């Protein structure tokens, strides 16, 4: 009901279908997406294309079980033997940027941008988000994106390698078709090794302390109301 | 005496003021900068801009005739520690060349706004010296491994244009541009910034030298090639 | 017999001389290269330039008809160890395609000067093979994680132009350009170069495969798909992979 699943020969296309919410992740969407990823391997299909309806790829989080479901989604994508080509049709923000980064490859529409607006909202990220972002845009730009909420445009994404290509859903599907013809076991090995570069990192004690501090702060409530931040 | 400190609203600007030596570091200057960084919070500032007076950001280290030269390595460690631990983001307004110790200092900034005529360089291979592991790891993260190899193994200069290409420079601009950006950053949520800065700085760049690294480090520094730098080297 | 060695001033040039196979590695070539690297400092040389004869830098590995093919992986380990341990900086003059084992070799050079028509590629996904962890880590560090994913998962070629963009190529230029730069580097302090090279090579790229990595590596190398890729190439047709 919140995603559409279609297959053309050996490519499975999964479309986020909450355009009116910019494909914001709620519990139902995350559950349905997780199942789609896990069931993609009933192939036939040897590649997945993940894309969104409307102007946005995914604008972030939209409830008690939501964090656990989100972890399970990322686990399912990380563990999938199939390569996921993200057709980033528009902005990927917050949890939506996390989702875009969990794709194996990215084909990005000209008007898409990538952003962690965490510094505007007083929030804090998990370590993987920061590490994978650093690997994809380079440390310098990651510092700007994280400390100042800087938007990464499609053009700079192509520059850094966040975007493998600039293009459309059709372009992504065409590439996924070529990839679907390659040797699955070679793809599986490389994906596992690449994902095991160290980005999957448990927060250090200092990181957890600051993380909990930010999430429990008054500044988070203040940013919603407005901002006059206090540092507490 | 060797730095200037000014504040405009929530932005503190710290300026290295030794233009007679192109802002080359010594014990006094380093200690003064360290205190400037540490006290930066005790006055409601939310962002720091670090910059150099005159044509250079920081041309390196010049310990003549520093009566406290023996304290210099310790003071430099303290300066880097203070910047790394500072809850406020430090925008480097790299107004001109950042060389050696000056490049290390530039890289310890949280963000960089680089003047069009500035360049970055480790001339260590010309002097027969060796760097700490952090300098090498942080450089690799900022310019990419490939360019890091050229900068370290051949003393290649990184222009402002290529700095922007790689992300070493976040922007090309002036002190005023850096100050304007800092003012925007100062309006953001401090706890969010602190967390991200901590995690980013804990990417593994802060690394104790391996046994083989220490042995080559000590050999380089204790070498006649350092004394030599016509600087015809012997490798001894 | 498979390498040429010349020296001008303090620069030793090592030329891969198996152009008939586009300098594709075998046991003999690798052993000879290893010896040249190890002996490079027995002269007055302070820098090495490594380059290929003919159109290619190194098109991969070709073990037909290598009587010592079973020695190849051990010889390859020794080559990479010799280059990693060499006190001398190696400037790769990548005169043409560097593919598979050739890309590995190019990446083990300390610096790269790349001819305008050269490209880099790991066609592993076309052949059903799997790489050691170092190749993947060093590639990611040179082209960036994003491009590394495309090169590894989709056999994407890295052009000279994009190599320059990412830093895989330090310069676009010729053998003479590489030799000129090597001469400059040869005038620098050897101890400083040695320290920096050691620390840079110790960035974590030299990594033992994790248990899951080894399991997938062995599975790929032992698969029917590897045979199918060789048959399909021998029959000039698209391969029909099974995922086993």
Swiss-Prot record, chain B:
Record keywords, A-Z: Fatty acid metabolism, Lipid metabolism, Lyase
Origin: domain of life: Bacteria
Reaction(s) catalysed (UniProt annotation): a (3S)-3-hydroxyacyl-CoA = a (2E)-enoyl-CoA + H2O; a 4-saturated-(3S)-3-hydroxyacyl-CoA = a (3E)-enoyl-CoA + H2O
Annotated InterPro entries: ClpP/crotonase-like_dom_sf, Enoyl-CoA_hyd/isom_CS, Enoyl-CoA_hydra/iso
Listed GO biological process terms: fatty acid beta-oxidation
Entry EC number(s): 4.2.1.17
GO MF term list: enoyl-CoA hydratase activity
Gene Ontology terms: cellular component: peptidoglycan-based cell wall; plasma membrane
One Pfam family here: ECH_1
UniProt-listed PROSITE patterns: ENOYL_COA_HYDRATASE
Protein family (similarity comment): Belongs to the enoyl-CoA hydratase/isomerase family.
Stated role: Could possibly oxidize fatty acids using specific components.
Protein known as: Probable enoyl-CoA hydratase EchA6
Originating species: Mycobacterium tuberculosis (strain ATCC 25618 / H37Rv)
Underlying gene: echA6
Curated annotation (Swiss-Prot), chain C:
Pfam families per the UniProt record, alphabetical: ECH_1
GO biological process assignments: fatty acid beta-oxidation
Catalytic activity line of the entry: a (3S)-3-hydroxyacyl-CoA = a (2E)-enoyl-CoA + H2O; a 4-saturated-(3S)-3-hydroxyacyl-CoA = a (3E)-enoyl-CoA + H2O
Name of the gene this protein is made from: echA6
GO MF, one example: enoyl-CoA hydratase activity
Protein family membership: Belongs to the enoyl-CoA hydratase/isomerase family.
Protein name: Probable enoyl-CoA hydratase EchA6
Keywords: Fatty acid metabolism, Lipid metabolism, Lyase
Keyword Lyase listed: yes
Origin species: Mycobacterium tuberculosis (strain ATCC 25618 / H37Rv)
Entry EC number(s): 4.2.1.17
PANTHER family per UniProt: (7AS)-7A-METHYL-1,5-DIOXO-2,3,5,6,7,7A-HEXAHYDRO-1H-INDENE-CARBOXYL-COA HYDROLASE, ENOYL-COA HYDRATASE-RELATED
GO cellular component annotations of the record: peptidoglycan-based cell wall; plasma membrane
UniProt xrefs under InterPro entries: ClpP/crotonase-like_dom_sf, Enoyl-CoA_hyd/isom_CS, Enoyl-CoA_hydra/iso
General function of this protein: Could possibly oxidize fatty acids using specific components.
């Amino acid at each position: 009901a919140m995603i559409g699943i279609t297959q053309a020969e050996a490519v499975l296309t999964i479309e986020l279908q909450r355009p009116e919410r910019r494909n914001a992740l709620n519990s139902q969407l995350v559950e349905e997406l997780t199942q789609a990823i896990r069931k993609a391997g009933d192939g036939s299909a040897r590649a997945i294309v993940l894309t969104g309806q409307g102007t946005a790829f995914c604008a972030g989080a939209d409830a008690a079980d939501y964090p656990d479901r989100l972890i399970e989604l990322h686990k399912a994508m990380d563990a999938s033997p199939m390569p996921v080509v993200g057709a980033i049709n528009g902005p990927a923000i917050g949890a939506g940027l996390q989702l875009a980064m969990q794709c194996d490859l990215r084909v990005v529409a000209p008007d898409a941008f990538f952003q962690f607006p965490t510094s505007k909202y007083g929030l804090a990220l998990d370590n993987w988000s920061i590490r994978r972002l650093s690997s994809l845009v380079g440390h310098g730009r990651a510092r700007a994106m994280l400390l100042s909420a800087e938007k990464l445009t499609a053009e700079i994404a192509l520059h850094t390698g966040m975007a493998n290509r600039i293009g459309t859903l059709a372009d992504a599907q065409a590439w996924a078709a070529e990839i679907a013809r390659l040797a699955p076991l070679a793809i599986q090995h490389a994906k596992r090794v690449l994902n095991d570069d160290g980005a999957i990192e448990e927060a250090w004690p200092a990181h957890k302390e600051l993380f909990d501090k930010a999430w429990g702060s008054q500044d988070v409530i203040e940013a919603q109301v407005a901002p006059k931040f206090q540092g507490a």
